[PDB]
Write a protein that binds this ligand. Sequence first.
Ligand SMILES: NC(=O)c1ccc[n+]([C@@H]2O[C@H](COP(=O)([O-])OP(=O)(O)OC[C@H]3O[C@@H](n4cnc5c(N)ncnc54)[C@H](O)[C@@H]3O)[C@@H](O)[C@H]2O)c1
Ligand SMILES: NC(=O)c1ccc[n+]([C@@H]2O[C@H](COP(=O)([O-])OP(=O)(O)OC[C@H]3O[C@@H](n4cnc5c(N)ncnc54)[C@H](O)[C@@H]3O)[C@@H](O)[C@H]2O)c1
Lengths: 279, 279, 279, 281, 280, 281
Amino acid sequence: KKVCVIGAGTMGSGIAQAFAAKGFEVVLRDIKDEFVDRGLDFINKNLSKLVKKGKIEEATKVEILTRISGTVDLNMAADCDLVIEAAVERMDIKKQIFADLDNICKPETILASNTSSLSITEVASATKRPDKVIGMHFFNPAPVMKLVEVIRGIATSQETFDAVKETSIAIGKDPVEVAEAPGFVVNRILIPMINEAVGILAEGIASVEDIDKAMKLGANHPMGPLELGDFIGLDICLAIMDVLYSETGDSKYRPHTLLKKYVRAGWLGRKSGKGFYDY
Amino acid sequence: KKVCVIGAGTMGSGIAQAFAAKGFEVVLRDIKDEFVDRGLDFINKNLSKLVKKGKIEEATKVEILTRISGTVDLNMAADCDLVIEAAVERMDIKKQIFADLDNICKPETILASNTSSLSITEVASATKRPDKVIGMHFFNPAPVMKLVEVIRGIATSQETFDAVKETSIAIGKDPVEVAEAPGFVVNRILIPMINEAVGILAEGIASVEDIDKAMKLGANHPMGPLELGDFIGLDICLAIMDVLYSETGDSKYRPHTLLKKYVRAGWLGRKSGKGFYDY
Amino acid sequence: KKVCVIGAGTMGSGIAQAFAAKGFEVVLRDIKDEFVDRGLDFINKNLSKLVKKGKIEEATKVEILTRISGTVDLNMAADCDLVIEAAVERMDIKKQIFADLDNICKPETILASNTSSLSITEVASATKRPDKVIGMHFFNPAPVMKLVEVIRGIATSQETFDAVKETSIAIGKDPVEVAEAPGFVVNRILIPMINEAVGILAEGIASVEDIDKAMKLGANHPMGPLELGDFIGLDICLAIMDVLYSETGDSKYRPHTLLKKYVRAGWLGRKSGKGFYDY
Amino acid sequence: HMKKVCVIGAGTMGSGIAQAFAAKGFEVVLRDIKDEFVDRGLDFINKNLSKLVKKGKIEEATKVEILTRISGTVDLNMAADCDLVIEAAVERMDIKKQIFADLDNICKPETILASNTSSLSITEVASATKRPDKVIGMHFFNPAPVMKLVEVIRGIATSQETFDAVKETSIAIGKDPVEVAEAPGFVVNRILIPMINEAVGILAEGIASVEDIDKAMKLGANHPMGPLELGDFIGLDICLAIMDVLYSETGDSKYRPHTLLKKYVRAGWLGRKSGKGFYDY
Amino acid sequence: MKKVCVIGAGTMGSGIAQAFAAKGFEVVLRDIKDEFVDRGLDFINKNLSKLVKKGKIEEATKVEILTRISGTVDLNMAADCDLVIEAAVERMDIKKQIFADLDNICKPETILASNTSSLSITEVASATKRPDKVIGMHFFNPAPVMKLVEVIRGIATSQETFDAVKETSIAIGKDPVEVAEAPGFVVNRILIPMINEAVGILAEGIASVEDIDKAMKLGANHPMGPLELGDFIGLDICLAIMDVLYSETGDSKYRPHTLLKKYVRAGWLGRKSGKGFYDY
Amino acid sequence: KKVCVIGAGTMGSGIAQAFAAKGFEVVLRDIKDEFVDRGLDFINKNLSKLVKKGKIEEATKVEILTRISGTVDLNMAADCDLVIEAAVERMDIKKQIFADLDNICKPETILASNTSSLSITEVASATKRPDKVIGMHFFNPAPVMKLVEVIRGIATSQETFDAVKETSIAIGKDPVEVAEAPGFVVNRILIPMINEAVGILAEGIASVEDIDKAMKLGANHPMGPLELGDFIGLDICLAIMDVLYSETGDSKYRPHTLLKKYVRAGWLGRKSGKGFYDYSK
Ligand SMILES: NC(=O)c1ccc[n+]([C@@H]2O[C@H](COP(=O)([O-])OP(=O)(O)OC[C@H]3O[C@@H](n4cnc5c(N)ncnc54)[C@H](O)[C@@H]3O)[C@@H](O)[C@H]2O)c1
Ligand SMILES: NC(=O)c1ccc[n+]([C@@H]2O[C@H](COP(=O)([O-])OP(=O)(O)OC[C@H]3O[C@@H](n4cnc5c(N)ncnc54)[C@H](O)[C@@H]3O)[C@@H](O)[C@H]2O)c1
């Protein structure tokens, strides 16, 4: 029924749009009016694009925007049935936010995090409602991508998973159940695949462009892995490999040294104008 | 030019079709008439499907079939410009055949292997022609799939590479350059991905179908890794990991114990009615 | 209920004895009279020792020996409800035995292996009743030791597992359910512990006596790890590590070089008069 | 010849160690930084002695004699004339060094300086003193009054004389010492905790249940506890920390802690002490 | 290149300064205070005096060389220099600061090089707006005599920046090699793991310290055995390099041996402490 | 003292020479007359160089050859005091030879192997005189190279070791004591250095020439690792890395895939005219 999204950045704003799009009332919290407005402006822009394409009615864009209430006040979360944290990827911030909501929110509230790399279970333990703590891992762009990885911490109750599953379906998404482990499903498979491509390039086995063509034509992938690395962001790819190696303690997942070098140069991919390809 | 394909199974016959179809004279060789004739039957069937599909006229079918001469006699390769060895077999006898071809063939002839598990360099060393020995890795089905991984043995000359590259383009393919290494590009990246999926299943992190769903929706792939494993054949997948682990000596590429158990059960995927899914 | 034990060595004989002791009619099959009679005579001696010590009455011993019929003829397994193979572990042979038994025996017959190191699943694939093949792993001495690790191949049915579980209880054993994996439970944990001790010794960290004393007093174990290795047999300990490393592909389970050296010396422990200690 | 010992850190382990010495005719000092800690340690010793009285293991008067040999304090200088000092305090290296450096200045030269640490380098601690030849590990097992094993840990500069002296003292207080050249996990932890970590791996992959793993080990290897219940008994946080040290020190992924063990610890499911680990309590 | 600034008046810095002045180049030698600069200049004066005394150069040659070296504390004196060499061993945070400051101060042509092998040149270069002009130039002690320079290219280092540094290296009598930035470059990447391996052999009682060293000297014709070499380099240094190799690669192949850790922890660092694998 | 060398190949002939130059009586055995004469020629030819460069007198050359008798009869080993096997690097054959020698030779005979790669302990176990079996690892060229790695099997006696140490000194060598382990000392350290260089090359970090120059100038080595590889032979280098990986079970010692590719090409180094460098052209 009523949802709070903590953080009005790229994912936060998209998650807010996704719920609001399906008739849910949405509180959207950030820490300065400027940041809130930036999120509302971004949603508004997305929704204009959709009206412009004839995909929705102008009245629908308005109905959706009116369902979203921006705020800088964390107490606005208190009567919400679901909170989705999409803040900065920093463990102490996660834990601080969840501990506080645990006190601010009514007992029934489910507390979810969109985190890619941090332990749901650890986050849960900072609260006295671990049974109600869960991961809800959306994919960019949140309004469009149907996949949600529903991450169960070891103490996440079946009741909590079931409600989030149903809520996920209710907003037009296709949820999958994942017991907490490093990289969940998608990143666990995909990022090492990008890291493997780096390895091939580093040893002069083939060129950036041949590696990518080989994967596109040979495995029927939409993008080649290096192109994909650039799209996701090489700093993100590296941080993910760092967590896989760190969490597993298995050198299997060691990020390649050439990857480290690209990142240290600021050659992060599309968003910096340069990565494995020049933009 | 004129080309010889050695091996009249589905890959060999397919490759011969791809050349004949582009105006090249082709000698298809296998070890007895009944293998040769089966392969020509297979090709005939393939070209028959393409008339019904509307893509070519029956006349063209006939013309394509006239360019292909079946034989048991390896001496018919003597004046060929390119010889493509496609018969899956042991290193000991592949070496013989390349050595045999080295004596038989005119000095211009390039000797190519379709292998993906054996060393191109090692095979080349059984000939006095190592600068003219090269890998040409086609993808199933050979007539339609555009990718060719052109595999350079350490002695393969730039001349030999450039000729095979241009020949590849002449038959409608999109060649990539690959220095010989374990798994080339496609397998080196793709198979460990399937192996990774096995690992996630094995630790009860997610079900078979949620793993595949997550990869299809999350990474926009047309098949999930486990479903893909069943399609390739889990025996084939295991054998590839075996090669990667054996060649690298890096336990990063260790095949998962669970994959070994599926294969020892004869649960090979589609071809046996059962793998990670049952059919 | 009627059981067949294949292999009149120490373990096979002990197994036959445990079954006979609990009311089961038992066929004991080996490849030659000499081995069969040696088996029966080992069981006689065990039972006579128990009489002498006053644990069983003479008439109990006589009844027990009556329930065991020695034979060299595998067709005597034909109507047994359970067959337990306890011959020496060579996959090619074990597969032959299991295939033969598959044709000889009635369809209800469950086929069990006492192997510690060969794949139950792979053995099962040699038969047309993979759902009736299973591991039953006994501990020396079988008449005395309570544990049975019941090893499910990936195709072993619930019904087959439930029947073996009940039978184990019926013979006064305490079965545990183990999905097939390298080392099952006990060896998977115990041998690497012995291997670890060897490493400590090899780096001069502590003496043989102090390593074993530390573990006895510190972990409340009845034998220290090196003693235990000597008791089990160092050749046996090394073969298990070899299997763990070979199946996992994880160098976590590499056997220590010092252990290899002891075994190559013939310094196997108690059975040779010398291992980590002198006997 | 040692007859006066100072124990530093009045927790479970330090108080157990003070009691083991007090019970065997040493003059014992027990130091902590706050009287509250000291008093609590005394209460803990009082309590274990009372349980022995009540079991009929010892007379009440014996208990009163034992308690009299122990003098609590917060003044570090009370260690000055001790023949032996056993530090059993916080496991943080920089503070441990400071303690040992101060003891080095405070103590007569004959005084042997020991640590009960399981995780930190004796060699490294010794290097903060001018008496590295007289620094040593004396690793006790909980409960210290009952368990006979002591792992006597030699730093690379520990002298034969220092070891001999600690060896014969251990034998004098009724303990059974073993000699261990410093390395990660000494003997017991180095072998035992990886057994526990291995059980977690078996569990994680659905190979067998918690109860079946433990039964298999108890019956199959003739152990009194299974690895998973033993982890719960030791404390899964303690188990994870040790694995962490083994992996960190060796740099060998052979000793990587299982990811599932990490998840139990992160949940606060530490075993008996939290009412939940691999089993419910 | 006419004018070079060397930052750091320690042994390494002063040595590099000397090598440049000896070959005709004008040099600015910079450090943090006058005492250090003067110490460095006295060190150089002494080296050159040794060369005069042994008959390698004439007194007037020594004087000429010394006059090409100007000493300072002020980093602004590097502004018109064509090459800057940051010699002092730094923390990453300070290094980045220094390079960022040089980037703002110097004329746009100036190439900014680092002698310091432990840190990523690519990472340092990202602290400036001239990453194309940031490079590694790794000398060997003593820098006036040792011919080898490992010229380390950051991933953004331009062909023009490398070519200039290669040419300058040859102009000062050195023998440069090209190295793409990677952990341990060439020399340390091969050499230090060899020492580490020796330690593993020692730890398992396979052979004694002396027999290990004898074996390598006589069997592989090495000038020093691995264990005495460890002592000469400094075992703390050796450990720190293995730490970097393991940390950067993430491969257990390069794990420092636990016995090496114990020697360092004891303060038994080798010659510099009077004791390592040998007693000095 | 009488010595028997099994194998008149490069190493055996060299070893035989080294013993006869120091006054020992030598029996040199191979399986055909042709191979014996080949060995004796090779020795004669080496000694002729030592004369024609004034290193020894013509009379010394003759004395030396006189102390050597070629044979095809293994029974000529029977009364020798030391047998050195330098035949063929196959475990079955070493076992076979040593089993037979154990029966043929008098009880006092010490049985030594020149093997680089095979277990001394295992070879010794095919005899009933394991206390008398040992490794004597010579370096090419055996007559010149001073180092000998004396390899103790786990059963090799102190007596046997000291005898072989004394004999090693007596023939003007500098022996070192090595407890059996993969690669002994020299190869265990040296070959992975070469393997490491290969990895630097494979990743485009530096060229062949620059790698070797870096090592020569930077480490004061006479040869760089890649040219050293070519000199030793890349097949030999790969076979050693294979043994290290095989015996240790540790990926630390995995041979680089690039090395494997060079060897498969027949680019083995100097012996084939091409390895990391071009020699023949
Ligand atoms: N970006 C992606 O593609 C992606 C994909 C999947 C998951 N995630 C996860 O989502 C999170 C990152 O989201 P993003 O990419 O939108 O980041 P972002 O930097 O775009 O937005 C973060 C926002 O959080 C706000 N914030 C910081 N502290 C806060 C607090 N205490 N309360 C409320 N708001 C606060 C910031 O002001 C900022 O607007 C991470 O946890 C990441 O793991 C991101
Ligand atoms: N060549 C080297 O530089 C080198 C270096 C280190 C160690 N080794 C060791 O030396 C041994 C041999 O090397 P090599 O270079 O002399 O080989 P080689 O092939 O030059 O000579 C081997 C000789 O052994 C003979 N032989 C085979 N079986 C025999 C038998 N039963 N009795 C007597 N002779 C027999 C052969 O006829 C041949 O003449 C190997 O064990 C090898 O590991 C050699």
